[PDB]
Amino acid sequence: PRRAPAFPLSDIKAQMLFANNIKAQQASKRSFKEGAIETYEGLLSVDPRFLSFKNELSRYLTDHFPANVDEYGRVYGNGVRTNFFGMRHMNGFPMIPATWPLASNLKKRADADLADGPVSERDNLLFRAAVRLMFSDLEPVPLKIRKGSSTCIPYFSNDMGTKIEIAERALEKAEEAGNLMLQGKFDDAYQLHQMGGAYYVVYRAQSTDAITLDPKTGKFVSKDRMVADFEYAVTGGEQGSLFAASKDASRLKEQYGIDVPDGFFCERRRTAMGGPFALNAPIMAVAQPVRNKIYSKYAYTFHHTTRLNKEEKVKEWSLCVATDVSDHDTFWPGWLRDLICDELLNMGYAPWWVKLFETSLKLPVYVGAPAPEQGHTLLGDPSNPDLEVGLSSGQGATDLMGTLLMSITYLVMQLDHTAPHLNSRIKDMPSACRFLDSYWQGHEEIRQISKSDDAMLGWTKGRALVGGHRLFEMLKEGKVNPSPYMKISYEHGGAFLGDILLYDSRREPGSAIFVGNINSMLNNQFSPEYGVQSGVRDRSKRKRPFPGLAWASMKDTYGACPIYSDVLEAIERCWWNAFGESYRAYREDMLKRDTLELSRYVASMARQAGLAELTPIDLEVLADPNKLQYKWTEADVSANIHEVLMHGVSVEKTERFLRSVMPR
Ligand SMILES: [Mn+2]
Numbered sequence: 127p128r129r130a131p132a133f134p135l136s137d138i139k140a141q142m143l144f145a146n147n148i149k150a151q152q153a154s155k156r157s158f159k160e161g162a163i164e165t166y167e168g169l170l171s172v173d174p175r176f177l178s179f180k181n182e183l184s185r186y187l188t189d190h191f192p193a194n195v196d197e198y199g200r201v202y203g204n205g206v207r208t209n210f211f212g213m214r215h216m217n218g219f220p221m222i223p224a225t226w227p228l229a230s231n232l233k234k235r236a237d238a239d240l241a242d243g244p245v246s247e248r249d250n251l252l253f254r255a256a257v258r259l260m261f262s263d264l265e266p267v268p269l270k271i272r273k274g275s276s277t278c279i280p281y282f283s284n285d286m287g288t289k290i291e292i293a294e295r296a297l298e299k300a301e302e303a304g305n306l307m308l309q310g311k312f313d314d315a316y317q318l319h320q321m322g323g324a325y326y327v328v329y330r331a332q333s334t335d336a337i338t339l340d341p342k343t344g345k346f347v348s349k350d351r352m353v354a355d356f357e358y359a360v361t362g363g364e365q366g367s368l369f370a371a372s373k374d375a376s377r378l379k380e381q382y383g384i385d386v387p388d389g390f391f392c393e394r395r396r397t398a399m400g401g402p403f404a405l406n407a408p409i410m411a412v413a414q415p416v417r418n419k420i421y422s423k424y425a426y427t428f429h430h431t432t433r434l435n436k437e438e439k440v441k442e443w444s445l446c447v448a449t450d451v452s453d454h455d456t457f458w459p460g461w462l463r464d465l466i467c468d469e470l471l472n473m474g475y476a477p478w479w480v481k482l483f484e485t486s487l488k489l490p491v492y493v494g495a496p497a498p499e500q501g502h503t504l505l506g507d508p509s510n511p512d513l514e515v516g517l518s519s520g521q522g523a524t525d526l527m528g529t530l531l532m533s534i535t536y537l538v539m540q541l542d543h544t545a546p547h548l549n550s551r552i553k554d555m556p557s558a559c560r561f562l563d564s565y566w567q568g569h570e571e572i573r574q575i576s577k578s579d580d581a582m583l584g585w586t587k588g589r590a591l592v593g594g595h596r597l598f599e600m601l602k603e604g605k606v607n608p609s610p611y612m613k614i615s616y617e618h619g620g621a622f623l624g625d626i627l628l629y630d631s632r633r634e635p636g637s638a639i640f641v642g643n644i645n646s647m648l649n650n651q652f653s654p655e656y657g658v659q660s661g662v663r664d665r666s667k668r669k670r671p672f673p674g675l676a677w678a679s680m681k682d683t684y685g686a687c688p689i690y691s692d693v694l695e696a697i698e699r700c701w702w703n704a705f706g707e708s709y710r711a712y713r714e715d716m717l718k719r720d721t722l723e724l725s726r727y728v729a730s731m732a733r734q735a736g737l738a739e740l741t742p743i744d745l746e747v748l749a750d751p752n753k754l755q756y757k758w759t760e761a762d763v764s765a766n767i768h769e770v771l772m773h774g775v776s777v778e779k780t781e782r783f784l785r786s787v788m789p790r
Contacts, residue, residue, distance in 0.1 A: 140502075142280070147282070159495070161218050179700050184210045191206045193208050199616050208619070209338065214346065221395055222498070225352075225359075226353075226354050226360075227493065228363065232514055238457070238613060253469075255558035255562040259562060259563055264788060270774045272751070272772055278326045278403060279492070286773055292320075293404075297407060300321070301479075313508070316508060324490040324504060325399035325489055325520055328398050329396065330655065331656075333653040351394050356500075372392070375391050401521055405485070405489075415784065428566075440582060440635050447583040447597065448616060449582070450618075458527065460487070467484045487517075487521060488514070490504055492505075529577060535614075539608050540585075580622055582627070648693070657670075666727055671751065673720065673749050682742035739764070
């Protein structure tokens, strides 16, 4: 059923993805790398005291605070949803091998019984209405770029001046590049404007993953994570194999002489992709305006900030269903990419821009190093982009692609199982747009709050309510997928964007509250994804610029968890046992040092002004900018803090670009 073509790095098609400079050449050849991360300055993730601390703390918390999740997956009582063993990983050392990314997900979708297009004309109108409401009356804004971020293929530059020039030039030449692609001249568009080529695959650590303790044996068991070998990936699963990666860490002793305590494992690794920046720039120039529109006009459904901000909406509901989606990015459908492009053309968007967008969602992928002695292979032919990888993580609008797919998918699930009486309001495009516009503003008896693959579905009192309960019961039974589009189930311990929905004895939205997930506090403080990069002088370019600051926002973020105090005390006690020092004093010192370091980066902060003006969000973001790529957005951050982390291209240049893209 068509194996994707594959080319070794030595092949000219792969060589052309890397410019003639040392960084790009090194990225092309980089071999498998592993090693302990520097968890905090001077502390390695495999330090024997640190592991002893994690062993004691994870056992203690699990023993004293067993999960409180009912049969319907609602969290109550102590606010705990699983054991605390997820922290038992040797951070920096990956499971082996990581997966080869699937070149085509068509068979994966068909075999999971998911549809190859909108099932009914109503659904077709709703997906298209989503495109019309999201992309219509957009306002230009400057194109912001993360400081220190890479341009990936083909230059691999991390220099801000170079990145700004690449982006400006890309906005100037996107039209000529898109028209070349409309003529089938992808090699020309790539050679002349670097628009095309491939995504560059980097494997990221998912630092904590499930682990259970077998009461029978007293031995810990890590969750098996299935990975595809090369044959499987290039044949869409027709050949080759899907098998459990090895998380066994015993090897670290033999290989590096690192002591491995019982029940500690190698980390789960996930594929992540960096896009060719010249192609992404023109897409980001439209995506940000779209985010601004949906987070303002449709803030009810899409703009989520604090626990209370979420709580206000959910408290008004009579029923709240916390859904889960299996493997969202890999199952994301290429037919939606095509439906979206078709609808943008219908709205009058420039064809050359739609073509760039379409191409960014069919691009080849260059696999670097999934394991020792493996990799350095290009999947797909850049001369004619035709992959179906699902949704690429580094595409310039991935968050929006997942949000559009899922928001309509959940609305369809509510229509299908609970509100057939609303079907008559969706007769054609005009009526579909009116209905979706009202639904997204939270004005219908069926509602939702969502972001990509996380969501909570709601029902107020009314005719749909009774159906809502049957849908919830169908999810609980878990025998039939309620959607024809993606694999949907209910979340075990319902949460939304990091906050757990804590129910009381009534088990009703009206008396439930959103609280911080104490397990996420533990993940962030003791299993960060990256080391502190103490050798990177410019802190704003680090993955974790000011780790100490999170101590100042901790109470605000996690204080409402029922066992907040208990956890902080267990930490103090266990850290004393392991290090013979106070964890609280250690964090207070780090907070002081980082607060002083911060004033050097903030123009408005006096040589030692302090943190008085900063919000909890500001602090969480400065300690972990990653939260700005999955939890919050630019407007949620104080302006002077956003500037520490991001730089932009002039709105004058983007304003002119946008005028040439958008309809009349
Ligand atoms: Mn959730």
